[PDB]
Amino acid sequence: TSSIVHLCAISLIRYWSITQAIEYNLKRTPRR
């Protein structure tokens, strides 16, 4: 089972470029 988290992590990273710009992007022009 711990073998999953293994690939998971990697995957996540490879798919890290999504969270950062998940909401903010939606409502462009963040910050007051």
Q: What is the DSSP string of 1-24?
A: -HHHHHHHHHHHHHTTTTTTTSST
Q: Is residue 5 within 8 Å of 11, Cβ to Cβ?
A: no
Method: NMR
As a whole number of angstroms, the distance between CA 6 and CA 29 comes to 36
Name, in order, each residue with C-beta under 8 angstroms of 24's C-beta and a sequence gap of 6 or more.
Answer: 30
Do 8 and 16 meet the contact criterion of CB atoms below 8 Å apart? no
**Maximal CA-CA distance, the chain:** 45
DSSP secondary structure code for residue 27 in this structure: T
Question: Which 8-state DSSP code applies to residue 32?
Answer: -
CA 4 vs. chain centroid, Å, equals: 18
CA–CA distance, 29 with 18 (Å, rounded to integer) = 17
